[PDB]
Design a binder for this molecule. Structure first.
Ligand SMILES: C[N+](C)(C)CCOP(=O)(O)O
Ligand SMILES: C[N+](C)(C)CCOP(=O)(O)O
Ligand SMILES: C[N+](C)(C)CCOP(=O)(O)O
Ligand SMILES: C[N+](C)(C)CCOP(=O)(O)O
Ligand SMILES: C[N+](C)(C)CCOP(=O)(O)O
Ligand SMILES: [Ca+2]
Ligand SMILES: [Ca+2]
Ligand SMILES: [Ca+2]
Ligand SMILES: [Ca+2]
Ligand SMILES: [Ca+2]
Ligand SMILES: [Ca+2]
Ligand SMILES: [Ca+2]
Ligand SMILES: [Ca+2]
Ligand SMILES: [Ca+2]
Ligand SMILES: [Ca+2]
Lengths: 206, 206, 206, 206, 206
């Protein structure tokens, strides 16, 4: 476990082999979650990349957040996809939170502490506990099958993940830097594994 | 009688069949009224939808508040329509208040705490007290016959009603979040009937 | 003697027959004056309309403040017209003051607290004392001959008149809602005559 | 002498014979200087005009500040011109300060308390002390030969002249209204001379 | 050994010949660096220019910071060029910090306090100690061969240079005007050498 407070991982050029592998302590399968993070890149109006990748040996897009060109954000759990379109694109660092709850199948998508309309996705699913979480590359198989054309080029940081659903208040206090307490993934106690060209440096966002 | 304070009704997907039914304790006909409510959708650029529908065995558009793409707001009482045009649309939650008075025929339309000019409509009409009030769908008959192309997808909440016309000071403190006593529909003691795929969640607006 | 404090005349529909008559305790002819007032409409982009008509049996446009579509404000005194151009038009309530002085011929025109350049007009003229002052229609004869295509739809209020010229400091306080004492027309002690479909409602502006 | 605080000269309409004449206590010839003033007109989109005209017997443009339509500010000392370009032109009051130095030829031009870049002009020159200074007309000879189409129509005031070069700090206060004492021209102690149709009224800017 | 505080070098016109030489107390070769500075010119929408030229005997563009019309900033070290596109251009003083690190190849580029994305450039390289550092002209040879069409017209100041990489806290303090202590070039103990029509005047930025 390592405190990465104030730091970030950076991926400086396109590649096929660079990535960070987060280890989570899961034992029970997920019936809801929240995930939040910060990232910064110029890719957005030239191609598309993977922002967060969650995979079991049985499904490779279990949960996955992804930017795709000329459309917008693309959230998917259990192989099924949903869209939040962005018309105007602009360059600056971005903070997102994203949550999903089985029973209702409602997903919320927060961009910079403002929320998008709610949507429905895979009501009643339960997400698998033995997983491969990966920054920088997109998985087409447990642990691997990366695609250079889906690479993150820039830095990414502040990834935290809870196994329940954050309320609008709590997402405001994470956004503003207030203390929270993750129970699946904690930036102040990370357990990760690096490979290829990725550096750890100070963060460009407040 | 339920206190819906700080909660809201969320319609996650398009339907023919999901809606909420508000039970209002009306005795006399209405000679004047004032209605207000919050609502958040991204439908506004693809099609129209009903925000508030109030129907009667003789008239299905007794009072109806409706967004119509590429023109703006439509407000109709007694099957008669009046139009507040809205040049530029943006996506964000909005609060509106609206009111009509038999004696003068004057309608006020308050968007986000700012007043539109006054317009005249249905002078001397009187609104029925035997009614069906529905959220989530437009009515074409007492109690149903829903249009999916008029479905509202998104959140709606804080609906309140008065048997008299509200004043500018009063609307302001509604907008600002001050206490009120509403006497026809009251969001802190609400008697409703819910049907379909609609859920109840904490509100995204402040 | 009526204290019209916090009220406005509302003309809710286009017509030929609704108006208000102001009674002015005139005795000496005018060699200089100042009038201010509030108003609010959506007509500005469709057609023009009259805001303040001052008629004497010898001249129907003795002092006439007019909005003409596609040009701006039109200020005429003594049948001579001077033009205050406005490029952008927006729907919101607007407050104006306007002055004239016989000795130098200089007119001022203030919109929402800011001044337009001074211009020359009717030096040496004297304005008549026995006259008809009408809100809502345009005059072509002492008290009569209305064209509907020049009528005003919307609200009008806080009209006040002095018989001298206000200083820039004075006009600022009238703007911020500070106190003054008019000496020709006084809104807090208004003597007037109503005729047609006009109502008297609380004012939309602060 | 005269204290002209809070007053201004106003030229109501275009003419061939109006202007005031400032009288200066010059003995030595100028090896530098700095001039500041306020003014307010709409002409700038129709034609150009003379803003401040300092002439000598040998040279009708010893120093001149001029607005040329479509191009921007024109500034000439000793017959030779330099430009500060201005693309967008909005009608409001404006404050200019501008200063020249012999030893380096450097000129600065401040508009509303903000500086344009530095340029070079008549390095080593020496301005003549027996000048004739005119507002509201352009000189083509000592105190004479006016062109009407170079006329200024509107308000000018607050003109002050030093015989050295003001620092950034000193322009700032004078812009902000603070006190700093001129030694060639002084608005609070003006010796002048009026001719034709010009008036003295309270100023429009703060 | 000079303190240049509150002052800037100023280049009033276009030339082949005017420039400033900065002398750096350099013995070991650079394996990393930061450099920061202020400038102000109206050139940016007519042509390009050089902001900071660093040249070695073997390599005339060892480190160089250049504005290219229609594109944005260009930054190159060791001959290799990298681009930070700037879409919209505005005339006003601007402040840039830039840095490079042999070990990882990461360059950073801060404009007016806000950071741009990290890129990669000449990993492993080391920069040379015996340099010619020049302001106002673009070196094509050790100490000369100036392009009149790559010349800076305007002011420039506050140039400082470290031999390590400044953290974001440090770069904000510099931007806000805080104190710092540079160790390769120092505006407050500057040892330099001038040539041509160039002057030293108080800075136009605060
Ligand atoms: C394009 N898409 C976002 C709809 C799905 C692509 O996912 P993938 O092939 O990398 O795993
Ligand atoms: C838009 N419109 C108001 C003119 C028609 C809507 O009618 P409806 O769907 O209640 O029948
Ligand atoms: C001055 N004007 C051209 C704008 C309008 C005059 O109208 P009218 O009062 O004669 O009817
Ligand atoms: C400003 N200008 C130098 C371009 C015009 C000068 O005209 P003039 O002084 O000879 O009358
Ligand atoms: C910025 N640039 C690469 C495009 C120009 C460099 O030009 P050069 O002057 O060293 O010959
Ligand atoms: Ca995949
Ligand atoms: Ca893939
Ligand atoms: Ca209907
Ligand atoms: Ca219908
Ligand atoms: Ca008339
Ligand atoms: Ca008429
Ligand atoms: Ca001349
Ligand atoms: Ca001339
Ligand atoms: Ca070169
Ligand atoms: Ca070159």
């Amino acid at each position: 476990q390592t405190d990465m407070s104030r730091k970030a991982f950076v991926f400086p050029k396109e590649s096929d082999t660079s990535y960070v592998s987060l280890k989570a302590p899961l034992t029970k399968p997920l019936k809801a979650f929240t995930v939040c993070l910060h990232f910064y890149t110029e890719l957005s109006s030239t191609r598309g990349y993977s922002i967060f990748s969650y995979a079991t040996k049985r499904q490779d897009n279990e949960i996955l957040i992804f930017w795709s060109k000329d459309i917008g954000y693309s959230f998917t759990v259990g192989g099924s996809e949903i869209l939040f379109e962005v018309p105007e694109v602009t360059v600056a660092p971005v903070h997102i939170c994203t949550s999903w709850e089985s029973a209702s199948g409602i997903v919320e998508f927060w961009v910079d502490g403002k929320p998008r309309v709610r949507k429905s996705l895979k009501k009643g699913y339960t997400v698998g506990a033995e997983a491969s979480i990966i920054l920088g590359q997109e998985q087409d198989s447990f642990g691997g099958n990366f695609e250079g054309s889906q690479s993150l080029v820039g830095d990414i940081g502040n990834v935290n993940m809870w196994d329940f659903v954050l309320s609008p208040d709590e997402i405001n206090t994470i956004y503003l830097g207030g203390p929270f307490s993750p129970n699946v993934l904690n930036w102040r106690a990370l357990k990760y594994e690096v490979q290829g060209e990725v550096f750890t440096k100070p963060q460009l966002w407040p």
